[PDB]
Design a protein around this ligand. Structure first.
Ligand SMILES: C[S@@+](CC[C@H](N)C(=O)[O-])C[C@H]1O[C@@H](n2cnc3c(N)ncnc32)[C@H](O)[C@@H]1O
Length: 666
């Protein structure tokens, strides 16, 4: 009985351990590499100050995606708190109430007068940490036994603590009344003190009814802000990343319960109005990213090797930063304002092709595949480690077999991902271009694989390392190569016979910037090829264009010419793949968007290049829900098109292997 409670309670307190560690990882890596502005912590000698170390036993390291996610999270809260201090008139005290503080040292960081980066907070700001009794006992003993911390709050087996500028109050927030009492005992009813209630991924664990009570309670406090940061599931509990996230949390015995009722950014808005907060500014983590300045973006890219962007889009859309206010006075200046635009788009449901479940397990991602006549070859990729091995795929109406093809040559290309692999030499060979090992180790060495001899042999290398480029075979047998992370030409043509790479970048201002992970395909029939979506090396912008082009094999200086540009929000996708099913019907598949998650209806769409009309190829609920889907790092083969391979590491909520899909005629 009351045991079942004291367990689910300690499991929730356990999540602090996980998140304080991650924040510490950012203190170790990011903060030292960052300028004064996005710094957070620093003394007069431009020497970084450290606060998360007092609360974390060991040194910790995270994936570049988790590290980025947590920097954004600190920037999220800090930026909000900043808009408040800057604006609040100079005669009002300010109290930041941290609901479920964990070991969060935000108080000491902002109070410490050594830290010149938080000077606006030295004078007139005070803090109250609220959390379970046990977690605070521990936290309070540290604070007392650490001269650096104790000095900051004016100090020299309890669970409470009191100082002029900092309080810590034991309280189970599930207990609405006791919280209502705490609000009163802390004189937060006072109109001459601006309250800033922060719930950083804590109310997320409590039930909708119990968390909302906390919110309504605070709404009775005149002049109060409520900043909440927590998970969303903007397309239901069944969207690929949502599914994984939710399950991860049941596993830890600390499920997200409030998010089940509050799925979207919009529901969060209605929630706060309903509960006494009339004024609400709200966006998801990627709008925060977008909102960061160019000099900050530049820095953040250079902090550490990163190439896990699909993940980052997914993660970002699943965290909302909600800033609410219960008074008209406070303005959401244009510097802090989020834009909100859910433009529901209805697409005609394609009547010619449908989507089948193909249960096919190559269990790898970001390799490449291409068919040489009959046989189907997949090379490299990661599973989750990088390999240089070749699988052969036997595709049947039911499933696909696969066997390792061992090689006879001693020299072999190194394990690599994000390369291309393309049939050349009249289906007799396979071209391997570029790729990378670690994100900071892009490759310039190119190889060819001879099926007849099963020998690898390295050819002319690139002048510039290149990965995440796209590539397709042209009619004449040559290979068109498109962008990727690179310092070289935005478009290459590899003459297979001549053995030369040639810069064929079209004279359109579009190709000014290198296009990363865009869709690319040619059609020998309609004598046309398309380019779809694609991101830019700023890791922020994502093209929404679909660019038709023709290829004049004889024009030696400008073989490729931009025929026609199209523009649709559904074209805005990083890491998608396209393939002609018909010279009039261009299948488009997956990828991620900076502007929101894709769902059942628009994850897979068709395009009629000529008439310019889109149609949806829906994923049935049966497969949306039952089968682990993760259209990222995947490939398309045609015998009937197959969507095999792919997966993602869902922000340390585990990993998700794409199980396989099949497009058939109706
Ligand atoms: C994931 S930690 C985050 C804490 C802090 N905001 C941070 O990011 O480091 C969530 C915290 O909320 C606290 N919490 C959740 N529900 C609570 C409740 N009902 N009463 C008191 N504390 C609660 C937990 O004890 C935990 O320390």
């Amino acid at each position: 009985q009351e045991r079942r409670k004291k367990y689910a309670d300690l499991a929730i307190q356990g999540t602090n351990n996980s998140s304080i560690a991650s924040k510490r990882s950012v203190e170790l890596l990011y903060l030292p590499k960052l300028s004064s502005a996005n710094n957070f912590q620093m003394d007069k000698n431009n020497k970084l100050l450290e606060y998360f170390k007092f609360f974390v036993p060991k040194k910790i390291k995270r994936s570049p995606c988790i590290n980025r996610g947590y920097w954004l999270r600190l920037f999220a809260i800090r930026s909000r708190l900043n808009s408040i201090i800057e604006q609040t008139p100079q005669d009002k005290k300010i109290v930041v109430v941290n609901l479920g503080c964990g070991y969060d040292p935000l108080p000491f960081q902002l109070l410490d007068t050594n830290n010149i980066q938080s000077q606006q907070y030295h004078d007139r700001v005070s803090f109250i940490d609220i959390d379970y009794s046990d977690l605070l006992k521990i936290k309070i003993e540290l604070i007392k036994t650490i001269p650096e911390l104790s000095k900051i709050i004016g100090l020299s087996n309890v669970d409470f603590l009191t100082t002029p500028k900092y309080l810590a109050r034991p309280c189970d927030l599930n207990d609405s009344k006791m919280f209502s009492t705490l609000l009163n005992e802390c004189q937060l009813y006072d109109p001459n003190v601006v309250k800033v209630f922060v719930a950083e991924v804590s109310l997320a664990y409590m039930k909708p009814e119990r968390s909302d009570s906390i919110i309504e309670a605070t709404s009775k406090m005149e002049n109060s802000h409520f900043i909440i940061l927590e998970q969303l599931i903007p397309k239901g509990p069944f969207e690929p990343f949502s599914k994984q996230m939710l399950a991860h949390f049941k596993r830890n015995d600390s499920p997200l319960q409030s998010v089940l009722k509050y799925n979207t950014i919009e529901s969060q808005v209605q929630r706060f109005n309903k509960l006494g907060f009339a004024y609400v500014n709200v966006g998801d983590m990627f709008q925060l990213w977008e909102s960061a300045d160019e000099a900050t973006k530049k820095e953040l890219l250079k902090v550490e090797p990163f190439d896990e962007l699909e993940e980052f889009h997914l993660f970002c859309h699943h965290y909302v930063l909600c800033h609410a206010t219960n008074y008209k006075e406070f303005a959401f200046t244009q510097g802090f304002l989020f834009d909100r635009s859910i433009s529901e788009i209805n697409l005609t449901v394609d009547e010619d092709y449908q989507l089948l479940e193909c249960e096919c397990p190559i269990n790898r991602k970001f390799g490449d595949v291409d068919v040489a006549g009959n046989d189907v070859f997949y090379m490299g990729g990661s599973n989750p480690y990088r390999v240089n091995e070749i699988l052969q795929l036997s595709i049947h109406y039911d499933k696909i077999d696969m066997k390792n093809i061992e090689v006879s040559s001693s020299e072999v290309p190194v394990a690599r991902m994000c390369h291309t692999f393309t049939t050349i030499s009249r289906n007799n060979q396979l071209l391997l271009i570029g790729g990378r090992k670690a994100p900071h180790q892009g490759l310039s060495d190119n190889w060819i694989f001879d099926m007849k001899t099963r020998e690898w042999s390295m050819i002319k290398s690139l002048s510039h390392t290149r990965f995440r480029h796209s590539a397709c075979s042209l009619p004449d047998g040559n290979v068109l190569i498109l962008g990727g992370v690179t310092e070289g030409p935005a478009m290459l043509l590899y003459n297979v016979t001549e053995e030369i790479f040639k810069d064929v970048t079209p004279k359109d201002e579009f190709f000014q910037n290198s296009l990363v992970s865009a869709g690319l395909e040619f059609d020998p029939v309609s004598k046309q090829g398309i380019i779809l979506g694609g991101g830019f090396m700023d890791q922020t912008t994502v093209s929404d264009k679909a660019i038709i082009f023709k290829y004049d094999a004889e024009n030696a200086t400008e073989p490729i010419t931009v025929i026609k540009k199209l523009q649709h929000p559904l074209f805005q996708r990083y890491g998608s793949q396209i393939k002609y099913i018909t010279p009039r019907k261009l299948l488009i598949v997956g990828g991620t968007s900076p502007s929101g998650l894709f769902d059942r209806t628009n994850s897979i769409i068709s395009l009629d290049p000529l008439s310019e009309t889109l149609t949806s190829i829906p994923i049935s609920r049966r497969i949306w829900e039952d089968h682990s889907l993760m259209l990222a790092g995947f490939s398309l083969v045609s015998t009937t098109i197959h969507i095999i391979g792919g997966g993602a590491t869902c922000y340390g909520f585990g990993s998700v292997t794409n199980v396989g899909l099949k497009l058939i005629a109706i």
